[PDB]
Nucleic acid binder design. Structure first.
Ligand SMILES: [Mg+2]
Ligand SMILES: [Mg+2]
Ligand SMILES: [Mg+2]
Ligand SMILES: [Mg+2]
Ligand SMILES: [Mg+2]
Ligand SMILES: [Mg+2]
Ligand SMILES: [Mg+2]
Ligand SMILES: [Mg+2]
Ligand SMILES: [Mg+2]
Ligand SMILES: [Mg+2]
Ligand SMILES: [Mg+2]
Ligand SMILES: [Mg+2]
Ligand SMILES: [Mg+2]
Ligand SMILES: [Mg+2]
Ligand SMILES: [Mg+2]
Ligand SMILES: [Mg+2]
Ligand SMILES: [Mg+2]
Ligand SMILES: [Mg+2]
Ligand SMILES: [Mg+2]
Ligand SMILES: [Mg+2]
Ligand SMILES: [Mg+2]
Ligand SMILES: [Mg+2]
Ligand SMILES: [Mg+2]
Ligand SMILES: [Mg+2]
Ligand SMILES: [Mg+2]
Ligand SMILES: [Mg+2]
Ligand SMILES: [Mg+2]
Ligand SMILES: [Mg+2]
Ligand SMILES: [Mg+2]
Ligand SMILES: [Mg+2]
Ligand SMILES: [Mg+2]
Ligand SMILES: [Mg+2]
Ligand SMILES: [Mg+2]
Ligand SMILES: [Mg+2]
Ligand SMILES: [Mg+2]
Ligand SMILES: [Mg+2]
Ligand SMILES: [Mg+2]
Ligand SMILES: [Mg+2]
Ligand SMILES: [Mg+2]
Ligand SMILES: [Mg+2]
Ligand SMILES: [Mg+2]
Ligand SMILES: [Mg+2]
Ligand SMILES: [Mg+2]
Ligand SMILES: [Mg+2]
Ligand SMILES: [Mg+2]
Ligand SMILES: [Mg+2]
Ligand SMILES: [Mg+2]
Ligand SMILES: [Mg+2]
Ligand SMILES: [Mg+2]
Ligand SMILES: [Mg+2]
Ligand SMILES: [Mg+2]
Ligand SMILES: [Mg+2]
Ligand SMILES: [Mg+2]
Ligand SMILES: [Mg+2]
Ligand SMILES: [Mg+2]
Ligand SMILES: [Mg+2]
Ligand SMILES: [Mg+2]
Ligand SMILES: [Mg+2]
Ligand SMILES: [Mg+2]
Ligand SMILES: [Mg+2]
Ligand SMILES: [Mg+2]
Ligand SMILES: [Mg+2]
Ligand SMILES: [Mg+2]
Ligand SMILES: [Mg+2]
Ligand SMILES: [Mg+2]
Ligand SMILES: [Mg+2]
Ligand SMILES: [Mg+2]
Ligand SMILES: [Mg+2]
Ligand SMILES: [Mg+2]
Ligand SMILES: [Mg+2]
Ligand SMILES: [Mg+2]
Ligand SMILES: [Mg+2]
Ligand SMILES: [Mg+2]
Ligand SMILES: [Mg+2]
Ligand SMILES: [Mg+2]
Ligand SMILES: [Mg+2]
Ligand SMILES: [Mg+2]
Ligand SMILES: [Mg+2]
Ligand SMILES: [Mg+2]
Ligand SMILES: [Mg+2]
Ligand SMILES: [Mg+2]
Ligand SMILES: [Mg+2]
Ligand SMILES: [Mg+2]
Ligand SMILES: [Mg+2]
Ligand SMILES: [Mg+2]
Ligand SMILES: [Mg+2]
Ligand SMILES: [Mg+2]
Ligand SMILES: [Mg+2]
Ligand SMILES: [Mg+2]
Ligand SMILES: [Mg+2]
Ligand SMILES: [Mg+2]
Ligand SMILES: [Mg+2]
Ligand SMILES: [Mg+2]
Ligand SMILES: [Mg+2]
Ligand SMILES: [Mg+2]
Ligand SMILES: [Mg+2]
Ligand SMILES: [Mg+2]
Ligand SMILES: [Mg+2]
Ligand SMILES: [Mg+2]
Ligand SMILES: [Mg+2]
Ligand SMILES: [Mg+2]
Ligand SMILES: [Mg+2]
Ligand SMILES: [Mg+2]
Ligand SMILES: [Mg+2]
Ligand SMILES: [Mg+2]
Ligand SMILES: [Mg+2]
Ligand SMILES: [Mg+2]
Ligand SMILES: [Mg+2]
Ligand SMILES: [Mg+2]
Ligand SMILES: [Mg+2]
Ligand SMILES: [Mg+2]
Ligand SMILES: [Mg+2]
Ligand SMILES: [Mg+2]
Ligand SMILES: [Mg+2]
Ligand SMILES: [Mg+2]
Ligand SMILES: [Mg+2]
Ligand SMILES: [Mg+2]
Ligand SMILES: [Mg+2]
Ligand SMILES: [Mg+2]
Ligand SMILES: [Mg+2]
Ligand SMILES: [Mg+2]
Ligand SMILES: [Mg+2]
Ligand SMILES: [Mg+2]
Ligand SMILES: [Mg+2]
Ligand SMILES: [Mg+2]
Ligand SMILES: [Mg+2]
Ligand SMILES: [Mg+2]
Ligand SMILES: [Mg+2]
Ligand SMILES: [Mg+2]
Ligand SMILES: [Mg+2]
Ligand SMILES: [Mg+2]
Ligand SMILES: [Mg+2]
Ligand SMILES: [Mg+2]
Ligand SMILES: [Mg+2]
Ligand SMILES: [Mg+2]
Ligand SMILES: [Mg+2]
Ligand SMILES: [Mg+2]
Ligand SMILES: [Mg+2]
Ligand SMILES: [Mg+2]
Ligand SMILES: [Mg+2]
Ligand SMILES: [Mg+2]
Ligand SMILES: [Mg+2]
Ligand SMILES: [Mg+2]
Ligand SMILES: [Mg+2]
Ligand SMILES: [Mg+2]
Ligand SMILES: [Mg+2]
Ligand SMILES: [Mg+2]
Ligand SMILES: [Mg+2]
Ligand SMILES: [Mg+2]
Ligand SMILES: [Mg+2]
Ligand SMILES: [Mg+2]
Ligand SMILES: [Mg+2]
Ligand SMILES: [Mg+2]
Ligand SMILES: [Mg+2]
Ligand SMILES: [Mg+2]
Ligand SMILES: [Mg+2]
Ligand SMILES: [Mg+2]
Ligand SMILES: [Mg+2]
Ligand SMILES: [Mg+2]
Ligand SMILES: [Mg+2]
Ligand SMILES: [Mg+2]
Ligand SMILES: [Mg+2]
Ligand SMILES: [Mg+2]
Ligand SMILES: [Mg+2]
Ligand SMILES: [Mg+2]
Ligand SMILES: [Mg+2]
Ligand SMILES: [Mg+2]
Ligand SMILES: [Mg+2]
Ligand SMILES: [Mg+2]
Ligand SMILES: [Mg+2]
Ligand SMILES: [Mg+2]
Ligand SMILES: [Mg+2]
Ligand SMILES: [Mg+2]
Ligand SMILES: [Mg+2]
Ligand SMILES: [Mg+2]
Ligand SMILES: [Mg+2]
Ligand SMILES: [Mg+2]
Ligand SMILES: [Mg+2]
Ligand SMILES: [Mg+2]
Ligand SMILES: [Mg+2]
Ligand SMILES: [Mg+2]
Ligand SMILES: [Mg+2]
Ligand SMILES: [Mg+2]
Ligand SMILES: [Mg+2]
Ligand SMILES: [Mg+2]
Ligand SMILES: [Mg+2]
Ligand SMILES: [Mg+2]
Ligand SMILES: [Mg+2]
Ligand SMILES: [Mg+2]
Ligand SMILES: [Mg+2]
Ligand SMILES: [Mg+2]
Ligand SMILES: [Mg+2]
Ligand SMILES: [Mg+2]
Ligand SMILES: [Mg+2]
Ligand SMILES: [Mg+2]
Ligand SMILES: [Mg+2]
Ligand SMILES: [Mg+2]
Ligand SMILES: [Mg+2]
Ligand SMILES: [Zn+2]
Lengths: 95, 107, 97, 70
RNA sequence: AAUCCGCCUCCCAACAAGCUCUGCGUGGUGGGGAAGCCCGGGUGACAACCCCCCGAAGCCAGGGAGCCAAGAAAAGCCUCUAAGCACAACCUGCGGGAACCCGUACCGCAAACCGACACAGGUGGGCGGGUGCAAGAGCACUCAGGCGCGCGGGAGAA
RNA sequence: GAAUGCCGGCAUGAGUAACGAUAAAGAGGGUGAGAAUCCCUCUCGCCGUAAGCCCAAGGGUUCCUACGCAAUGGUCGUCAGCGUAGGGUUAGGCGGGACCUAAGGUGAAGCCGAAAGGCGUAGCCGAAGGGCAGCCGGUUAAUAUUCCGGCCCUUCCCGCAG
RNA sequence: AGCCGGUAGCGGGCGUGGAUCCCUGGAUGUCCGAAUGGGGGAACCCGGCCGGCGGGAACGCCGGUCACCGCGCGCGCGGGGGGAACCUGGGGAACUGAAACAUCUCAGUACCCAGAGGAGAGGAAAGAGAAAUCGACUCCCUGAGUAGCGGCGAGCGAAAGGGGACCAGCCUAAACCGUCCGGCUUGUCCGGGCGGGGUCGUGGGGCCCUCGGACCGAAUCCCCAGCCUAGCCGAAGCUGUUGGGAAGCAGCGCCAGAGAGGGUGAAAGCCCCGUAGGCGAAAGGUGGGGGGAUAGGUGAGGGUACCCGAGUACCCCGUGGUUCGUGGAGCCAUGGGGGAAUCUGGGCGGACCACCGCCUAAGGCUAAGUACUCCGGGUGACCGAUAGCGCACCAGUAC
């Protein structure tokens, strides 16, 4: 069955993602098929906040090899939610 | 469906062939994919280890080399003789290994 | 060109044989074939329009089975055909075959 | 998860109702996300927990399905 | 069907206006801001931000004239009424909420595209500064910017 | 033992021709096991209706950073569009879709054809044409009309008023 | 009794309370694909209706549902697409051979198309063809390279009969009887559905008199044996010696319904895996064998002369099929024209006629014996990495 916890996969860990916490912008890896609207809801019910803005972008898998064997990593989508003025997502403030 | 192993961890086996013919020991391990058993203190080999956290001071370690399972014979816990194994059905009727010399269970 | 909705008569392939010379039976040396090539013989298809149940039904039918259309119309009387589409009438009609 | 814990889980689940089953999957799907988040920052040494939870959820939804099937 | 559109008649208006849409200027405000000098950044700086000239192929635009070869459709949009419905509905103004999916890196006259090659070839559109030469997108030099072309060093025969 | 045989390997030509525009180089400093070839500075030269800049195709990570130099680079290589890893592409207003039609395609009705299939007013699809609301600046190593700031705007839902 | 695939490692777990693994059944099963809500450059996009989630009306997500065609009274059922060969049907070449070439050949092959299915086709005489005979069909041997066909060239090439494999026969239409429904030109009507009846070549049936009054039995259904999809039991050797290693050599034994074969440090009946001989299914599949049921089946004179498959037979024209290439050219089939009869009817026995015989057209089905090999297994005087499949290897890949 579909729950918010199916839509939010993992937090994005990088200099750039962390830089957002200050202004209330949390960046998650979400399921590649999930809509801004649905991510807004998912984040709201999982981290008890008010999502105000949602930015999403697709992230192509990097082609990578192991010896003879060429391949690709999985494609991912990342979402950047803006919580309402003053709120916070403590699980991410983290760090 | 499964490899047939006539021997197991850690019944007591006679090593009947190879450099260590005659030795007796517990089966420390059974490796069915390779069809092999590790017998305690049988088939020792000198392996080089790099100077590493796991082994500072480096040099060498001793390891037990696996034996092809066919080289090994369980020793019967009743008669103390090395034996072929037979199956006997109990009343359960679970089945068990029994020595082929006397009739004793081998577990 | 095509198929009789009644008899099922289809276009068939026939050879067209060209011959030359005098038949033996007429004292000639015999007939020589100077060509064979395939051709088709079509059914003599024509249109028959009929009113049945105040609707205009039309059949594409080989001339030999032109009377079989009208015979179908006759057997049609025992049928509850009014209100139906002309596709529907023709189906019922045809089913009577 | 231990084999006996698995039987235990099934017996207990089977006693539940659909609605109770749904509530509980949601809770487990939630508990998995935490595991994920922890796994991703290198703070889950106990990583077998992930395969575990995932199968619990499977067992549960499996049983939810059982109920609703007839 | 129509109060619309077309056609006929009459009255007032008419190189006016009015109304309406756009361009440009201004405009609360917000920004930027050199050389040089110190190690992309600081400073210069409270930076100054003004006048005159040139001036488009761009804009006002659906402008104007001429010509013959006589120069898309459909929706948006306005209007007309039909079933309906007229506590509805639509218009205008205000307020609150709502606003999805895909692309977006980088090359792009080329060492990343088409040419088996980091190939003197091929590749559509826009910008393309200054001076002089009658003009120019020509030519020379040169700004911004970018390069010296991924073997070199000598020698100084045919 | 021969088929200008087939497949493979290795010779010869030969340290030979060549190293791909005659725009052009020089020095000092740095780095490193190693430097004409990488970084920095100064000097010199070339392009400048381009050999600069921006879009669209096509390409598909080649972008940025760290660590590397076996091979790839016509030489070298400490460098690189190369190896490994990590990061990086953020939109109601840009583009396309939830709008329109063009050729053409497809195709209720319908027509035709041994089978396969061919046609066909409507309709539907089909755009680099029509329609449609975003400008200036700041910020990153790397994205920005997308984030931020400032000032503007569009549609949909609901409501209130007229 | 180990295990968390190839796959070791870091980091963690599970298993005699029976894991991993194997077989069967079930659940889950994003998107595309016949692809089927609609669109589309397959794997993306965009909807309607019902229900649900969120603060939820806009927005978005979740569940269900929505293509078209056919058949049957909106609803039911079905179709669609794939499959290596095999099969039928609808179309159908050429090189080549003829030492040139046209008829002829190649060949009804290659190939395209449709369709089936585990086979398909064919099948229960309007047969054969000379026997006073045979007795559905299919398939093998033979008949026979015969008969014949043939620019009587090149070439092509039957059938009956005999021996075998398998074995099986049925259902209808019509007459006539009953019933419902419909028509307008009111019934002794005509027509359509359904039921009854009937099914054949010594002709059979219908109707009307006379007489007579249980056995067979499925190709459908049910049960079961047997089979498949995992498995399991399975005899007998120790010691010495050379040697890295014994299974070699030596000594003394033993099993054998098992001395097939493969492994084990070299060369092993007795170490391992096996082998002979046996055993095994809760579940799914099969079940042509066994059993049972059901459908269905079955008389004799006499009279009547009602019925016995129509654009059909039949004749002519044009063609194909057959061994038959226009030939003395019948037969089977049919594109065109003409066009009957119901047993005193019709077709056939190679033009035609007579005689003498054979057979009953114009409706349908029908196991088996036969073809094939994607798949599983067994076996090779088959290959052994330039071989053997294109591929022993991550190949229909790189390129
Ligand atoms: Mg699911
Ligand atoms: Mg940063
Ligand atoms: Mg996106
Ligand atoms: Mg986006
Ligand atoms: Mg992967
Ligand atoms: Mg066993
Ligand atoms: Mg010993
Ligand atoms: Mg057991
Ligand atoms: Mg002719
Ligand atoms: Mg003649
Ligand atoms: Mg004569
Ligand atoms: Mg002739
Ligand atoms: Mg007519
Ligand atoms: Mg005719
Ligand atoms: Mg006629
Ligand atoms: Mg389990
Ligand atoms: Mg009118
Ligand atoms: Mg009026
Ligand atoms: Mg202005
Ligand atoms: Mg203004
Ligand atoms: Mg400044
Ligand atoms: Mg400065
Ligand atoms: Mg200052
Ligand atoms: Mg100062
Ligand atoms: Mg004009
Ligand atoms: Mg038009
Ligand atoms: Mg339209
Ligand atoms: Mg009204
Ligand atoms: Mg508003
Ligand atoms: Mg949508
Ligand atoms: Mg961008
Ligand atoms: Mg860019
Ligand atoms: Mg470049
Ligand atoms: Mg650029
Ligand atoms: Mg050029
Ligand atoms: Mg250009
Ligand atoms: Mg460039
Ligand atoms: Mg190139
Ligand atoms: Mg290249
Ligand atoms: Mg170069
Ligand atoms: Mg070039
Ligand atoms: Mg050009
Ligand atoms: Mg000038
Ligand atoms: Mg000049
Ligand atoms: Mg000049
Ligand atoms: Mg100039
Ligand atoms: Mg020039
Ligand atoms: Mg410069
Ligand atoms: Mg140069
Ligand atoms: Mg010289
Ligand atoms: Mg020779
Ligand atoms: Mg040569
Ligand atoms: Mg040569
Ligand atoms: Mg050769
Ligand atoms: Mg050779
Ligand atoms: Mg060769
Ligand atoms: Mg060679
Ligand atoms: Mg050489
Ligand atoms: Mg030399
Ligand atoms: Mg030379
Ligand atoms: Mg020379
Ligand atoms: Mg030379
Ligand atoms: Mg060259
Ligand atoms: Mg030279
Ligand atoms: Mg060069
Ligand atoms: Mg050069
Ligand atoms: Mg020159
Ligand atoms: Mg130096
Ligand atoms: Mg260098
Ligand atoms: Mg160097
Ligand atoms: Mg230098
Ligand atoms: Mg150089
Ligand atoms: Mg440099
Ligand atoms: Mg120049
Ligand atoms: Mg210039
Ligand atoms: Mg490429
Ligand atoms: Mg790469
Ligand atoms: Mg970049
Ligand atoms: Mg890179
Ligand atoms: Mg780079
Ligand atoms: Mg570096
Ligand atoms: Mg290198
Ligand atoms: Mg190198
Ligand atoms: Mg080197
Ligand atoms: Mg390396
Ligand atoms: Mg190289
Ligand atoms: Mg090199
Ligand atoms: Mg090169
Ligand atoms: Mg270095
Ligand atoms: Mg490079
Ligand atoms: Mg790189
Ligand atoms: Mg914005
Ligand atoms: Mg736009
Ligand atoms: Mg919408
Ligand atoms: Mg569209
Ligand atoms: Mg359209
Ligand atoms: Mg078409
Ligand atoms: Mg059209
Ligand atoms: Mg439309
Ligand atoms: Mg457009
Ligand atoms: Mg446009
Ligand atoms: Mg738009
Ligand atoms: Mg603006
Ligand atoms: Mg950039
Ligand atoms: Mg960036
Ligand atoms: Mg903004
Ligand atoms: Mg009001
Ligand atoms: Mg693994
Ligand atoms: Mg470990
Ligand atoms: Mg472990
Ligand atoms: Mg059990
Ligand atoms: Mg299964
Ligand atoms: Mg999903
Ligand atoms: Mg699908
Ligand atoms: Mg679809
Ligand atoms: Mg479609
Ligand atoms: Mg709803
Ligand atoms: Mg909310
Ligand atoms: Mg809602
Ligand atoms: Mg949601
Ligand atoms: Mg849905
Ligand atoms: Mg739906
Ligand atoms: Mg089909
Ligand atoms: Mg099929
Ligand atoms: Mg055929
Ligand atoms: Mg056909
Ligand atoms: Mg044919
Ligand atoms: Mg065929
Ligand atoms: Mg042809
Ligand atoms: Mg020929
Ligand atoms: Mg040939
Ligand atoms: Mg010949
Ligand atoms: Mg010839
Ligand atoms: Mg010849
Ligand atoms: Mg010739
Ligand atoms: Mg020929
Ligand atoms: Mg031939
Ligand atoms: Mg032929
Ligand atoms: Mg073939
Ligand atoms: Mg098919
Ligand atoms: Mg069979
Ligand atoms: Mg059959
Ligand atoms: Mg059949
Ligand atoms: Mg019969
Ligand atoms: Mg003979
Ligand atoms: Mg002759
Ligand atoms: Mg022939
Ligand atoms: Mg004959
Ligand atoms: Mg025979
Ligand atoms: Mg026979
Ligand atoms: Mg047989
Ligand atoms: Mg009747
Ligand atoms: Mg009647
Ligand atoms: Mg009746
Ligand atoms: Mg009779
Ligand atoms: Mg039957
Ligand atoms: Mg055994
Ligand atoms: Mg044994
Ligand atoms: Mg020794
Ligand atoms: Mg021994
Ligand atoms: Mg001996
Ligand atoms: Mg034997
Ligand atoms: Mg043997
Ligand atoms: Mg052997
Ligand atoms: Mg060895
Ligand atoms: Mg021997
Ligand atoms: Mg031997
Ligand atoms: Mg052996
Ligand atoms: Mg046996
Ligand atoms: Mg056996
Ligand atoms: Mg009688
Ligand atoms: Mg009669
Ligand atoms: Mg008859
Ligand atoms: Mg008939
Ligand atoms: Mg004829
Ligand atoms: Mg013929
Ligand atoms: Mg003749
Ligand atoms: Mg004939
Ligand atoms: Mg005919
Ligand atoms: Mg007769
Ligand atoms: Mg007669
Ligand atoms: Mg006949
Ligand atoms: Mg005849
Ligand atoms: Mg005759
Ligand atoms: Mg006859
Ligand atoms: Mg006969
Ligand atoms: Mg049949
Ligand atoms: Mg049978
Ligand atoms: Mg058969
Ligand atoms: Mg077979
Ligand atoms: Mg096989
Ligand atoms: Mg061999
Ligand atoms: Mg090889
Ligand atoms: Mg090979
Ligand atoms: Mg070899
Ligand atoms: Mg193979
Ligand atoms: Mg190979
Ligand atoms: Mg490969
Ligand atoms: Zn014992």
């Amino acid at each position: 069955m579909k729950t918010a916890y199916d839509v939010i996969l993992a937090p994005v860990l990088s200099e750039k993602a962390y830089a957002g916490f200050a202004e209330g912008k949390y960046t998650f890896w979400v399921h590649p098929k999930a809509t801004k609207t649905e991510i807004k809801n998912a984040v709201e019910t999982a981290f008890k906040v008010k999502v105000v803005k949602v930015n999403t972008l697709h992230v192509r898998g990097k082609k990578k090899r192991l010896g003879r064997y060429l391949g690709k990593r999985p494609d991912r989508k990342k979402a950047i939610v803006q919580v309402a003025p003053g709120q916070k997502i403590e699980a991410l403030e983290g760090l | 469906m499964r490899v047939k192993m006539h021997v197991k961890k850690g019944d007591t086996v006679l090593v009947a062939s190879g450099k260590y013919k005659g030795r007796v020991g517990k089966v420390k391990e059974v490796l069915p994919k390779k069809y092999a058993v590790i017998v305690e203190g049988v088939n020792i080999v000198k392996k080089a280890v790099r100077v590493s956290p796991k082994y500072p001071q480096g040099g060498f370690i001793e390891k037990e080399a696996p034996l092809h399972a066919s080289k090994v014979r369980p020793i019967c816990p009743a008669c103390g003789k090395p034996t072929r194994v037979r199956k006997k059905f109990l009343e359960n009727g679970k089945k068990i290994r029994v020595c082929a010399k006397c009739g004793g269970a081998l577990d | 060109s095509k198929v009789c909705e009644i008899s099922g008569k289809r276009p068939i392939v026939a050879n067209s044989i060209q011959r030359r010379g005098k038949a033996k039976r007429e004292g000639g040396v015999g007939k020589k074939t100077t060509g064979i090539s395939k051709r088709r013989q079509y059914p003599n298809l024509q249109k028959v329009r009929v009113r049945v149940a105040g609707q205009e039904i039309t059949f594409r039918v080989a001339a030999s089975h032109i009377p079989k259309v009208y015979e179908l119309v006759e057997r049609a009387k025992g049928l509850k055909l009014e209100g139906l589409s002309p596709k529907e009438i023709k189906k019922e009609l045809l089913k009577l075959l | 998860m231990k084999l006996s814990e698995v039987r235990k889980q099934l017996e207990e689940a089977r006693k539940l109702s659909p609605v109770e089953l749904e509530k509980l999957v949601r809770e487990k799907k939630r508990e998995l996300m935490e595991l994920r988040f922890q796994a991703s920052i290198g703070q889950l040494s106990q990583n077998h927990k992930i395969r575990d939870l995932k199968r619990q959820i499977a067992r549960l939804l499996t049983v939810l399905n059982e109920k609703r099937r007839q």
